[PDB]
């Protein structure tokens, strides 16, 4: 509520999953202001940002990490 | 991609855009005007909340504090192609001569590109022929080399730059890209057009083989600053095509001054004597695109106006580091009615090496410099003694030095209007022999005055026959 | 043994990767100026991190920037690459790692960015350790007095301006005067002297650095040299960090060393190609960051900047490895104004000066060194005993000539002793002329100066002194190799003019004078 | 020697080109396989530690 | 000759790259749902060169 | 206490503290970092609500905004006492040499003190017997007075400093302190320790009798600014003990320019060359604690670098405003191997007047200066023409000038390694009597080159008249 957040998912999020992740983020405030995005170029991943900290466990991250072998 | 103009102070305009579609740092704001034409600013600083500070590129005396502005998305785009050949353009790549607008099918490219990478650079220092002999065997060109001229206020820099374009249109094709940075309207316009149209080869005027882009002290500082980049794009097209293009910049001093004015108007912290903090980097981005890649090569000359004799001035000081060869024009020689008026001394070239320009070329160049260097040392001797008390052997040195100094003068195909006779193109390797003969002493009996303006040594021999 | 690969894998993936959701720090750009981003207020950023700017739409590359000013609610970060692409609102993530460069044996004979990325297009660098840039100086007890010489290969420097391992000798000059020529000769002279050369090339042209690299390649000087490069087109941040990356590489050579020609070499030489252009780049960076301008518009800490850069050059004692690192900064004075800001700073923080003048250069004399004002404050400690004994007479005679230099056009019309002094001075000055890319080994210089100091070249006419030197050297190389070997072998002797070397050299020079005609 | 170094670099550059092509092909194929596979359980991976 | 050899090596080793692509595709996400067209099938569809 | 660092802009940082307990100016806020490695700062301003601007005095590279900042409640505290003898410190007072930490039991005093009050000042000026004949005669020190050593780089400055330390250690009990402001980490950190450890005027090594503090070149401007004050604080303990102390400062101009850089970093308006606006006050905080109080005295000998060669420049001008003597060491007196390479005609001293040094001392000093000036003038007569042109009473003047110039040479107790001659300490009165005798009498029948390296006139007479 006090803090703002943003979320990105490869596929269009279903409503039940949207509420599930909304209530999942109860570490800080519960149902914080979350602006769910798609970014379809993202694949099977979830990028959640709360405040000035991000989390990026999306498969693009692991693909880039493997690509670092180049 | 639609904004609103917030402030306008002088030629600096602040526009505001929606936060999601703020223009990049070097986009064209393209303000539309009621008459149908448009004012094409460029962004320079993204500040605040979707607010951009831009330079005018134009008058900015006809616009309010609320005009809609359409972001182009791309930087300033200029035509490139054979279609833009033999045409006169401004900084925005709009034909400013009487001919019609460039068609919409002509490829357009941004002016802010990147210079060739380090790998693409070439190390072979092939000599580029010009026809002005005193330039060919004092300080020759270099393909993908930045020659420059110095001195100013009367000495013929613009005239030698016109002569080079004419002679290099005689040689091969020499598609030349003249970049008029803040050129005087009289000098740049109706004299370059007039002379190039007059200079004719194969029933196709040299004007029709060269592309001219003229900034204008009259145009605001931003136009005079980015005109060099526009001309660089025009030449870089032909370089990518593989042809050996030749790019000419007029008074890079004015390029530096325009940069200083733009920086001051932008509120940038002043550096050195009120000059821009980015003095080095602007010259870097303008000069680094002029080089020789494996495919093509933008050989170039850049005239420079040194204030008075102050070579410490920030503009010549900055540009020195980027030059492969320097030519120093002095008024004292000009008082001697010499078209080149180039100083044989104090005009160096990095490719003056035995194994880059031929073994004899280096030693004959040094010997000519040695002969001329001697003449200076005993100038007062000749002055008060009238050649008296000379070693006699020195008298010949004196005589050969005066003959050399007069022989450097060459009728310029572009100087026919002032007083000269028709111009002569003196090819290198055909007149290095001429100078070798003069040093050997084949002209030790011809009078001094006959080496005045003839070109080859065979020419002065033929003149002496009469 | 594929079983080894199977065992190494299948365990790190299952229980070797944390894969733990935790929130890493980022920020958003709020204003992009002239290559400067604010990155909003990204917290937990060290005072000189390298921010990452991950790729976004319309850009599949990652561009790095240095976080220099850490303001409240603003981190003004200078961009290392091109700022044409970074836009307002771009998300920027901060690595926790300070600027680091690859170093060691692998990075040898390669042209690289300040960041260590190759620009030679010859493949990636091979390395296993990265040395952080911007290290604290070695310290007080860590160093040792400079004793081992650095034979540059040009007579004037090696005789009158000693350069020793650990010394910071400045090549101060103006316009083009051979500063890069003196440096490139010094680098070329280290073919078999157990040294690793670093060239930095700050603010130069891509064509100029390519030409220098081609010159080193042509003389087989790329098996022991590194070249860093931050050309003029590069952003001011890259030029700003170029010399620091170069001396980080040099520090790695100094501390650990590399296997050069089958032996461990812990001595390094670094040539900051232009500290003048480095200071100009730093001034641009500071002024675009709105930092307060000091004298001549340079920020207040340019002295601290070049000082921390140069003081990392040292001669470590035996306890810490015995390595060394000689700095050869280069400065581009305007109109020979040595009193300008950076020239004064660098001459104050450096150990000696090599004043190159335009007058001497355009006087026909190639190496335009000015012995009167140039000084190496290390002194004779950075010379072999042979050169040290020989060069005292040279220094005295050159000083005498400089005292009476006004009589070159009156030399004949003077006292006999004064005429002799002027003639000897002219012969010595003609002898110190040297072409380019022609370094003279130490024994050769010792022999030449032994000849010149003693009354041997008096018969030789002045204009032919250079030809005399050239063909005399050729004679020694082909006719008397043993004399050169003997001089080289006992160069360190306390009393170099020993009877055996003395008589051998005298016989060789007498034989050459008899055979040749002048 | 210069020719030999050129062949080594040419093979290395060819190796980089092949690696980039393989990466692009894997990305295109990975998208197809992932879409047919489904991504229902991706949410569970976001709270192993947060 | 180097260009010809590289093209020959690339064409000849395309199946090996596909074999490596399958391993990478299998390890692309560290898992593969059984209800899928198949990693090999997608690689064949994305075989390209 | 326990503030938080808010801003980091190069060396300058700003820390935010609570409304109360805000650090005062020069309160030395410490930043815990790494492993006990504290980035001690120095508060210079108080801003707004608890924000205080401080100078780095260290790397300030590994820092991040938001770290803890600890206020010490007092300026930088440095160890003081005999525990500092024979040790090498940085500005912060931590020993940088090999030996271990000083330890908590040793007294620590603030770096920023106030000079002695008005009453404590010595009403009259007492000569300081430095022992060296040329200095004691021509440019005598003043007890509690500054001195300049304008000598060539490598003419004997370090040897002179060693000799003064030896004399202040031997004759009077005394000690010495060396303040290497902005001293190179080679020529200072190492080229000094070995010289002062090998040098042994007595059983004790010069190193064991001197407190060394180095503000190295690589340290930020704050360290180079305050290293002089650290040296003064270390010497003030021994002064308060009633001893007489020599404080050697190396190139006080480096202190001035460090102050200039600090002021520029703080954003203060520049002043008259770009120097700090507080140039006079900064040079007053330093150099005013160098005074002869009732209890004890701190004499100083400060090397000075003249920018360009302008004795009118603000830095050397402000230094000269606080100088009581000047010694111009010269290499010309070094080719002719005289150990004190002091030019008697350029070195001056305020205390050289009849009232303080007595009538006879002033008379003999004036006479020596007069004969040396005559000899300098007759340089041209002797060189152009020769000795024969010298008139009567002017041949004698040059003859005596030779013997005076050689007699100034003295064998130092620290020079017995360079030359092997035993050391000699000539009191001022002995110098006065010796030079008076040399001028009005004896010394003409004794040939020159026999006054070489002798003490009193009696010493040369007895020794070299056998
Ligand atoms: N020792 C030398 N012998 C012969 N020619 C020399 C020598 N030094 C310099 N030159 C000539 O002078 C030209 C310029 O010298 P160089 O580039 O080394 O000088 P610089 O001071 O480093 O110049 P810049 O400031 O332009 O980089 C060289 O290309 C060469 O033509
Ligand atoms: N080759 C030449 N022949 C005759 N006059 C010349 C020549 N070059 C220059 N001039 C003189 O110089 C004037 C123009 O000089 P210009 O080339 O414009 O120098 P700048 O461009 O530095 O002003 C002409 O009006 C003419 O009088
Ligand atoms: Mg003009
Ligand atoms: Mg150079």
Coordinates of C-alpha atoms in Angstrom, one line a residue, chain D residues 22-50:
Chain D
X22 CA 22.5 -21.9 -32.1
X23 CA 21.4 -19.6 -29.4
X24 CA 18.8 -18.0 -31.6
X25 CA 17.6 -21.4 -32.8
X26 CA 17.3 -22.6 -29.2
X27 CA 15.4 -19.4 -28.2
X28 CA 12.9 -19.9 -31.0
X29 CA 12.5 -23.6 -30.2
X30 CA 12.4 -23.0 -26.5
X31 CA 9.5 -20.7 -27.0
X32 CA 7.6 -23.4 -29.0
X33 CA 8.4 -26.1 -26.4
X34 CA 7.5 -23.9 -23.5
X35 CA 4.2 -22.8 -25.0
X36 CA 3.2 -26.5 -25.6
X37 CA 4.5 -27.3 -22.2
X38 CA 2.7 -24.6 -20.3
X39 CA 3.9 -22.4 -17.5
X40 CA 1.4 -23.0 -14.6
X41 CA 4.0 -23.7 -11.9
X42 CA 6.3 -20.6 -12.6
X43 CA 4.6 -18.7 -9.7
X44 CA 5.8 -21.3 -7.2
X45 CA 9.4 -20.5 -8.1
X46 CA 9.0 -16.9 -7.1
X47 CA 8.6 -17.6 -3.3
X48 CA 11.3 -20.1 -2.4
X49 CA 12.9 -17.3 -0.3
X50 CA 10.6 -14.4 -0.6

